[PDB]
Paper text:
Fusion is accomplished by HIV-1 Envelope (Env), a trimeric glycoprotein containing three copies of the receptor-binding gp120 subunit and three copies of the membrane-anchored gp41 subunit (West et al., 2014). Binding of gp120 to the host receptor CD4 induces conformational changes that expose the binding site for a coreceptor, CCR5 or CXCR4, whose binding results in further changes culminating in insertion of the gp41 fusion peptide into the host cell membrane and fusion of the two bilayers (Pancera et al., 2017). We present two cryo-EM sCD4-bound SOSIP Env structures in complex with CD4-induced (CD4i) coreceptor-mimicking antibodies and with 8ANC195, a broadly neutralizing antibody (bNAb) that recognizes the gp120-gp41 interface (Scharf et al., 2014, Scharf et al., 2015, Scheid et al., 2011). 8ANC195 Fab was added to rigidify the gp120-gp41 interface and induce partial closure of fully open, sCD4-bound Env (Scharf et al., 2015, Wang et al., 2016a), allowing investigation of the partially open Env conformation.
The second structure, solved at 4.06 Å resolution, is a complex of the clade B B41 SOSIP Env (Pugach et al., 2015) with sCD4, the CD4i antibody 21c (Xiang et al., 2002), and 8ANC195 (B41-sCD4-21c-8ANC195 complex). In addition, unlike the V1V2 regions in the BG505-sCD4-17b-8ANC195 and B41-sCD4-17b structures, the displaced V1V2 loops in the B41-sCD4-21c-8ANC195 structure exhibited ordered density, allowing the structure of the displaced V1V2 to be determined. The density for the displaced V1V2 in the B41-sCD4-21c-8ANC195 structure, although at lower resolution than central parts of the complex, showed interactions with sCD4 and could be modeled as five β-strands using information from structures of V1V2 in monomeric scaffolds and closed Env trimers. In our model, strands A and D continue the anti-parallel β sheet that starts and ends with the gp120 β2 and β3 strands in Env structures with a 4-stranded bridging sheet. Whereas the V2 and D strands are anti-parallel in V1V2 scaffold and closed Env structures, V2 appears to be parallel to strand D in the displaced V1V2 based on density for the strand C to V2 connection. Contacts between the displaced V1V2 and sCD4 predicted from the 8.9 Å structure of BG505-sCD4-17b-8ANC105 (Wang et al., 2016a) were revealed at higher resolution in the B41-sCD4-21c-8ANC195 structure to involve interactions between sCD4 strands B, E, and the D–E connecting loop with the V1V2 D and V2 strands. In the B41-sCD4-21c-8ANC195 structure, 21c interactions with the core region of gp120 map exclusively to the heavy chain, and interactions with sCD4 map primarily to the light chain, conserving critical interactions observed in the gp120-21c-sCD4 crystal structure despite gp120 sequence variations.
Author numbering:
A (entry chain B): 518 to 544, 564 to 652
B (entry chain J): 1 to 124
C (entry chain P): 1 to 131
D (entry chain F): 48 to 57, 67 to 128, 147 to 181, 191 to 300, 324 to 359, 361 to 395, 397 to 399, 408 to 502
E (entry chain G): 1 to 97
F (entry chain Q): 1 to 107
G (entry chain K): 3 to 113
The structure:
Amino acid sequence: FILGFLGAAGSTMGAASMALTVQARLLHMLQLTVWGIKQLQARVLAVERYLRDQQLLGIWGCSGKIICCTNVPWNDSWSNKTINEIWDNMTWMQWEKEIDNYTQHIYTLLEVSQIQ
Amino acid sequence: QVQVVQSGAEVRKPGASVKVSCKVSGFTLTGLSIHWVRQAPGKGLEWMGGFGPEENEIIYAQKFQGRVSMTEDTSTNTAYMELSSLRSEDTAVYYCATGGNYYNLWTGYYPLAYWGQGTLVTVS
Amino acid sequence: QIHLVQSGTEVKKPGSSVTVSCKAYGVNTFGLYAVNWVRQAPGQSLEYIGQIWRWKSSASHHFRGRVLISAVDLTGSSPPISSLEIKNLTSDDTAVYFCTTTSTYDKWSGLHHDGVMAFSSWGQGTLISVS
Amino acid sequence: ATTTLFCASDNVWATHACVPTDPNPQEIVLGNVTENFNMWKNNMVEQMHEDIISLWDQSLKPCVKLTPLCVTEKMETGEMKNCSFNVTTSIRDKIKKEYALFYKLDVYRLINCNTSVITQACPKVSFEPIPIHYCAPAGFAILKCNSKTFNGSGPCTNVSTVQCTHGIRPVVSTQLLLNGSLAEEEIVIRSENITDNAKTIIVQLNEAVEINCTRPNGNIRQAHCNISKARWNETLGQIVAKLEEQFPNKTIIFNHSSGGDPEIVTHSFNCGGEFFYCNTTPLFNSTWNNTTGGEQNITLQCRIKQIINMWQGVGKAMYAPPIRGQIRCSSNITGLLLTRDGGRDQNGTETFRPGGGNMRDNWRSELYKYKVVKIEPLGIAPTACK
Amino acid sequence: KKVVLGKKGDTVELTCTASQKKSIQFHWKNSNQIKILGNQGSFLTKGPSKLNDRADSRRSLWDQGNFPLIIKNLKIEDSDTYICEVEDQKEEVQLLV
Amino acid sequence: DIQMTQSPSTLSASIGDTVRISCRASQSITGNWVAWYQQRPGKAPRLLIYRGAALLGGVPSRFSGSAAGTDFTLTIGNLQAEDFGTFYCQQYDTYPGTFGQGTKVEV
Amino acid sequence: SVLTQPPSVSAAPGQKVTISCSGSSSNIGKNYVSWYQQLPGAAPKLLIFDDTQRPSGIPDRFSGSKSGTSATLAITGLQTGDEADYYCGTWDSSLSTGQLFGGGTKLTVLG
Ligand SMILES: *[C@@H]1O[C@H](CO)[C@@H](O[C@@H]2O[C@H](CO)[C@@H](O[C@@H]3O[C@H](CO[C@H]4O[C@H](CO[C@H]5O[C@H](CO)[C@@H](O)[C@H](O)[C@@H]5O)[C@@H](O)[C@H](O[C@H]5O[C@H](CO)[C@@H](O)[C@H](O)[C@@H]5O)[C@@H]4O)[C@@H](O)[C@H](O[C@H]4O[C@H](CO)[C@@H](O)[C@H](O)[C@@H]4O[C@H]4O[C@H](CO)[C@@H](O)[C@H](O)[C@@H]4O[C@H]4O[C@H](CO)[C@@H](O)[C@H](O)[C@@H]4O)[C@@H]3O)[C@H](O)[C@H]2NC(C)=O)[C@H](O)[C@H]1NC(C)=O
Ligand SMILES: *[C@@H]1O[C@H](CO)[C@@H](O[C@@H]2O[C@H](CO)[C@@H](O[C@@H]3O[C@H](CO)[C@@H](O)[C@H](O[C@H]4O[C@H](CO)[C@@H](O)[C@H](O)[C@@H]4O[C@H]4O[C@H](CO)[C@@H](O)[C@H](O)[C@@H]4O)[C@@H]3O)[C@H](O)[C@H]2NC(C)=O)[C@H](O)[C@H]1NC(C)=O
Ligand SMILES: *[C@@H]1O[C@H](CO)[C@@H](O[C@@H]2O[C@H](CO)[C@@H](O[C@@H]3O[C@H](CO[C@H]4O[C@H](CO)[C@@H](O)[C@H](O)[C@@H]4O)[C@@H](O)[C@H](O[C@H]4O[C@H](CO)[C@@H](O)[C@H](O)[C@@H]4O)[C@@H]3O)[C@H](O)[C@H]2NC(C)=O)[C@H](O)[C@H]1NC(C)=O
Ligand SMILES: *[C@@H]1O[C@H](CO)[C@@H](O[C@@H]2O[C@H](CO)[C@@H](O[C@@H]3O[C@H](CO)[C@@H](O)[C@H](O)[C@@H]3O)[C@H](O)[C@H]2NC(C)=O)[C@H](O)[C@H]1NC(C)=O
Ligand SMILES: *[C@@H]1O[C@H](CO)[C@@H](O[C@@H]2O[C@H](CO)[C@@H](O)[C@H](O)[C@H]2NC(C)=O)[C@H](O)[C@H]1NC(C)=O
Ligand SMILES: *[C@@H]1O[C@H](CO)[C@@H](O[C@@H]2O[C@H](CO)[C@@H](O)[C@H](O)[C@H]2NC(C)=O)[C@H](O)[C@H]1NC(C)=O
Ligand SMILES: *[C@@H]1O[C@H](CO)[C@@H](O[C@@H]2O[C@H](CO)[C@@H](O)[C@H](O)[C@H]2NC(C)=O)[C@H](O)[C@H]1NC(C)=O
Ligand SMILES: *[C@@H]1O[C@H](CO)[C@@H](O[C@@H]2O[C@H](CO)[C@@H](O)[C@H](O)[C@H]2NC(C)=O)[C@H](O)[C@H]1NC(C)=O
Ligand SMILES: *[C@@H]1O[C@H](CO)[C@@H](O[C@@H]2O[C@H](CO)[C@@H](O)[C@H](O)[C@H]2NC(C)=O)[C@H](O)[C@H]1NC(C)=O
Ligand SMILES: *[C@@H]1O[C@H](CO)[C@@H](O)[C@H](O)[C@H]1NC(C)=O
Ligand SMILES: *[C@@H]1O[C@H](CO)[C@@H](O)[C@H](O)[C@H]1NC(C)=O
Ligand SMILES: *[C@@H]1O[C@H](CO)[C@@H](O)[C@H](O)[C@H]1NC(C)=O
Ligand SMILES: *[C@@H]1O[C@H](CO)[C@@H](O)[C@H](O)[C@H]1NC(C)=O
Ligand SMILES: *[C@@H]1O[C@H](CO)[C@@H](O)[C@H](O)[C@H]1NC(C)=O
Ligand SMILES: *[C@@H]1O[C@H](CO)[C@@H](O)[C@H](O)[C@H]1NC(C)=O
Ligand SMILES: *[C@@H]1O[C@H](CO)[C@@H](O)[C@H](O)[C@H]1NC(C)=O
Ligand SMILES: *[C@@H]1O[C@H](CO)[C@@H](O)[C@H](O)[C@H]1NC(C)=O
Ligand SMILES: *[C@@H]1O[C@H](CO)[C@@H](O)[C@H](O)[C@H]1NC(C)=O
């Protein structure tokens, strides 16, 4: 059920958030035991990857929530841009092309504010 | 060290067959490593059969078109050459000749390192 | 490797046109690679001209209509060749011209920002003067 | 990122290595994306190549495998470097001090090679290339183009997303493509690099040309193919029409493979446990200005050979002794593996001999659209928030 | 950038080197861009040239990255530069009398 | 556009200098969309450094740089005899960018 | 397909004497030449393989070489010990089908 995480790519970001809301609301021989367990293996692997990213959000105080309000203020050198261009002129591709070194630093600061 | 021992002397008739055996002891048998060469007393050697760069035929040298058959049993470590329809100058000496364990991969031009003793087939 | 080589060096009378030719050895095609064009006055700083990013020819907006670009994919006996069409030869277009290439392959390279690019390799430049 | 990507659709390999099917369709159409596709720099090729290595050393085992063994017998005497290191001459243990002092290789550094010979069993095992739906692992995606004039390189605009690939069958065939998937609109001509005249030009067809090899008698190891003439004339006509409307601008000339190891001179393919090597001279004659060989029922004399050169690694292999009955090998001619010999100034023409022999090139036509991509679902946005 | 001399008729050796140990696809060419060899996976072609029969490559070195070329029956009609392409190594070796 | 200003516009340096060259921006470039170029007289102005803190493979490991919001620092380490080049800094943030002014090093 | 080599070989025993094996480009001007030794009456063995390499019994007493479209074999001065028959042998790469052997060499000494 993680296939449709990317159906709104190319479009802007608020339309992608509305698409996330819509797509989340929308969703006896040896051959038996050979073709039966690999389905369960894929199911358990998908469940464990999902739960892995769930606790990865949970260490920031964002467990379960698609959109959560955290507590780390800016550095003003983190894309000093007006909100209109932020949500209407740029996709995700430009921005995770733009701030990767900064998103490592935001990972560190979110962990530090999450413990206190 | 590998020893190669041929079959015994064998007397046949014009139009009969001959099945020359070739005992090999000293390596394991592949399916290519054995050529078969005839010599007539009074002239040089002559290649009866063996393998080269054409990729199935243990090739028959342009005078064996319907009377020869060459099959190599790798489990018994013994080769078995066959020749039927014995003619006037099929009265010669056979040789089970064998290439050794040296740089074989390609098996076109490898020579005959190890040898039998020479069997004699006479036509009476 | 990229051993980008242009055509010969000319000299021009005013009020004419010229097609500058830049050959591109070692290039797969212009789908994964984009051709940007630079000029240089003799004694000034360098100056952007144009782009063939994803086969969309466009010069810049301060420099529209006069100089526009075409590009030829590799064909049979020909490497990919980008050509530059310059109209209305004035007296102060006297300059050394440069063609460049960049890698468009992965999005997350950093050599390209939506057609606004850093220039990976460089030709040898052709001088055009006025008699 | 590039990962291990598993298998398959619906008693030796696919039982042990692969999963069952999925209820297809499973596609997600994307909108205003433009993902940059290159076919000649893919890393689905090597994974699949090693995966078919894992197939055919467990499904069709040859009786004897004759592989190289090239090693640097006792001793590691070559050492770090320099010169005056001997070994070899008389048998494999006499002296032969070599002079260098920078190194470059002997028999760069030295190797005395060897031949590991191996005998494997041999049950008379049947074979059939089953379709293999290559399905992506957890948290990954396989992107896919949709335009029918897709040149491998260039960007694709109609990018779709699947979870798992389409029908792919393990058919090794030199000189010719068999049982491949065709094109929707029109034929396509490629290369890794045109003007380089050394990369295997792949041509993929739109007309499902058929081929019939059978073994009749009076001989044990004789067989032949038949192809429909006037389907082949139309096919070669639109191929030379494409090659004349794009890359030359010259005269055409076809020919046969000009020598080498004979698994490239003949159309080679495995069928039912028989390795057909079929002569492929009379197919290639379309010397044609753009404007005696059995003109309706074209016959390809074909030998069955069973001491084969491995495409798997380097070396030869011997299988079980041959079959007694008659074998039907009706298949689809789907493409061509062609090369060039560009030149020469008087010509004018171009000699357009075929090539092939790579088996990875025979996967780039069926790994045609696909690109392995890794999702990351974590993002950071500066909102108000409340 | 090497120059090798063989008088007439004898064998002669040319080497590409490759540091990947895979027996990858590679090619030899003459000066006027006519092929002499070509690897196709783990097989052997020849070049549609004036050297179809007399050109040869020993095969077992290909796993080691050693890519050889043995030319036999040398005469006056071989005096031109031969060029490797393996990945990018566009060398230039020359043969003379 | 967004105006750049390279400084100092001309210096001189002995062999084995750590030459630190700033390049000012009118706006504040977040995301570091600036490149560093070298041009010797007569030849091709090849690229040195893309994205501020990423070294190209063909450039040796003696050049570096950093970011200061509106400023960008190019750093030579162990200046040799071949790197006596007129330098340039491209901003490639907005369409289209412009370059610096130059730093023609002497002794 | 023909392998012309001189039948009658007579010289003084001990003075490094040579004989050739002549053929064609499809026969000998392409590939390796194998010198075989046959005693007059006994089963044959090989003398020299790949024109330079030898088995354990022979090595140093003979010298073989390949010169264009002809081979060359030489004795390094024995007397009556290897006074026997010798046979050049190679495979034919043309569809003149297979492995070939030389006609005849009568190596005798002066005695
Ligand atoms: C795999 O498949 C993919 C997709 O299937 C392949 O990708 C395709 O590749 C082909 C390459 O063959 C591309 O064709 C070329 O496209 C470029 C780009 O053209 C754009 O820009 C032009 C700029 O025009 C300017 O002026 C006009 C007004 O005059 C203005 O309106 C415009 O905005 C701009 O200001 C446009 O003209 C052009 O419009 C085209 O597209 C429209 C649809 O959008 C269409 O309706 C139009 O009719 C028009 O066709 C487009 O916006 C072109 O530059 C290029 O054109 C050159 O080449 C062709 C054939 O080679 C030739 O007929 C042309 O005349 C032109 O040739 C000139 O340039 C050559 C450069 O090599 C030069 O050598 C020639 O001598 C010739 O020069 C002459 O004229 C110039 C002035 O033009 C002058 O300076 C000279 O002195 C001399 O007199 C091709 O059309 C496809 O676009 C591309 N498709 C996609 C989707 O990517 C991929 O290649 C395949 N890969 C492989 C390996 O096979
Ligand atoms: C491209 O794709 C097509 C489509 O899949 C492939 O065509 C298939 O090819 C296979 C093999 O060539 C073929 O399978 C055979 O079909 C025959 C007719 O249906 C069967 O009779 C045959 O079974 C015999 O052979 C098996 C293996 O030896 C035995 O296990 C079996 O018991 C049968 O053996 C008896 O009959 C033979 C007949 O001579 C006799 O010698 C034996 O002694 C014994 O008595 C196979 O099942 C498929 O039917 C083909 N499919 C179609 C639709 O035609 C084609 O091969 C692909 N191309 C490539 C290159 O792979
Ligand atoms: C796809 O296939 C094409 C086939 O042509 C390849 O094209 C070849 O590309 C290589 C390099 O990519 C070219 O080699 C370079 O050529 C440059 C131009 O010189 C040529 O042209 C002049 C005038 O036209 C001639 O006088 C001259 O003889 C050449 O023919 C040279 O400047 C280069 O030399 C520089 O680099 C070398 C190192 O490689 C240095 O040693 C030199 O001193 C010099 O600094 C270089 O030699 C080659 O010429 C192209 N072929 C042809 C026929 O032109 C593509 O590369 C290939 N692309 C891909 C992606 O595979
Ligand atoms: C298709 O390939 C074959 C080889 O597989 C080509 O045949 C060869 O062609 C060349 C060039 O004609 C021949 O070389 C020379 O030919 C001239 C002709 O006058 C002759 O005088 C020379 O003595 C020399 O032979 C070569 O012999 C020939 N080889 C064979 C085996 O036929 C053929 O040319 C190719 N087809 C086309 C259309 O080019
Ligand atoms: C590994 O290679 C060596 C060296 O080639 C082999 O030793 C022998 O080498 C001489 C060289 O003239 C050959 O004549 C012999 O025939 C080789 N050995 C034999 C018994 O044939 C060594 O045998 C090789 N080891 C293998 C093949 O496993
Ligand atoms: C883009 O590709 C999709 C397929 O991924 C195309 O959708 C198909 O369109 C045809 C005819 O329009 C239908 O028969 C198929 O059922 C459609 N498939 C799916 C999955 O929707 C689409 O038409 C393409 N669009 C463009 C503009 O090329
Ligand atoms: C495939 O068949 C062709 C047709 O005979 C063979 O090619 C040559 O054809 C000419 C007639 O134009 C004959 O004179 C030659 O004898 C044929 N052979 C050669 C080697 O030139 C071709 O040899 C056949 N290939 C195979 C592998 O059997
Ligand atoms: C090529 O040859 C085959 C065999 O001769 C042809 O197939 C025959 O077609 C007739 C048509 O009535 C049938 O009666 C036969 O039973 C078929 N035989 C076989 C073995 O299939 C085929 O039609 C020929 N192709 C062309 C274009 O004539
Ligand atoms: C942040 O630091 C990283 C270093 O990990 C820089 O990003 C990469 O830099 C390397 C150079 O070693 C390049 O090869 C990579 O291509 C860069 N990553 C990407 C995604 O392009 C990055 O430049 C730094 N960002 C700053 C200083 O703003
Ligand atoms: C950018 O930041 C400065 C101070 O950090 C601020 O004064 C300015 O308003 C910001 N730009 C915008 C567009 O808000
Ligand atoms: C793509 O953009 C066009 C106009 O630019 C718009 O009509 C269309 O809805 C967009 N599609 C998506 C999926 O964003
Ligand atoms: C090949 O065999 C199939 C099977 O019947 C047949 O439909 C087709 O017409 C045959 N093709 C030719 C050229 O005989
Ligand atoms: C193919 O058919 C055309 C008629 O459209 C004919 O002129 C041509 O000679 C044919 N070529 C062959 C090779 O059969
Ligand atoms: C196309 O090819 C023909 C024949 O080779 C030639 O006469 C013509 O000039 C070519 N066209 C161009 C534009 O070069
Ligand atoms: C063309 O090839 C066919 C074989 O299909 C042959 O019979 C014919 O003689 C060839 N024609 C020419 C002109 O070479
Ligand atoms: C093709 O036609 C031209 C005339 O337009 C002629 O000179 C040439 O000889 C023809 N091609 C052949 C192979 O005869
Ligand atoms: C192939 O074609 C030849 C020539 O018509 C015919 O004799 C033979 O029976 C055909 N074989 C098959 C299997 O169609
Ligand atoms: C060959 O192609 C035809 C064309 O539709 C198809 O019907 C047939 O199933 C194909 N044969 C296969 C896939 O074995």
